[PDB]
Design a protein around this nucleic acid. Structure first.
Length: 59
DNA sequence: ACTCGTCGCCCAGAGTTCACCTTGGAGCCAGGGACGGTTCATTTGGGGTGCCGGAAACGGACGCGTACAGGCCGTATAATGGGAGCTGTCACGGATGCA
C-alpha cells in the first residue's frame, strides 16, 4: 500500500542513488522543484522589483 | 726436167761518240732617280659640358568620405523532466562492493 513504511523507504533508497549519467543526474536534480503559476510568478516578480529597488537605494 | 727461200757477203750510211770553234748570255758591280713611310707645323669644323632656366610629368603624401564584416540586441496566447544501443571472445589477477 501507500502507508506503513511500504514505499517511503524505496523512495529514499532511490533518491540515494549514484545515477552515473551526468544528464540523468541533472534531470534528477531538476525534478526536486515544483512548478509555479501566475500568482506565484507575479509575487516573485514583485519580490524581484523590491530587491532591485533596495539594492539601487543602497548603492 | 728446173727456182724463190734461204745462206753468206759487200758496200752505203747514219747517228754516235770524240773532241774542235763561236756567242748569247747571269750576274755583278756601278750609278742614278722619285717616292713614300715618316715626321712635323697647322686648322678650324666639330665633339663636349655644367648649369640652371624651367616646364612639366610623376610619384607619393594627406585629409576626408564610403563600404561590407563582424558584433550586440531584441522579438510578450502558450509553449515546463530523453532517445538510444546492441551488446555470439577467452583467460585471468585482482579490486570491490556486500557478504
Amino acid at each position: 500500500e501507500d502507508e506503513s513504511e511500504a514505499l517511503r523507504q524505496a523512495r529514499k533508497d532511490a533518491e540515494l542513488t549514484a545515477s552515473a549519467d551526468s544528464v540523468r543526474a541533472y534531470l534528477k536534480q531538476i525534478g526536486k522543484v515544483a512548478l509555479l503559476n501566475a500568482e506565484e510568478e507575479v509575487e516573485l516578480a514583485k519580490r524581484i522589483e523590491a530587491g532591485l529597488y533596495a539594492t539601487q537605494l543602497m548603492t
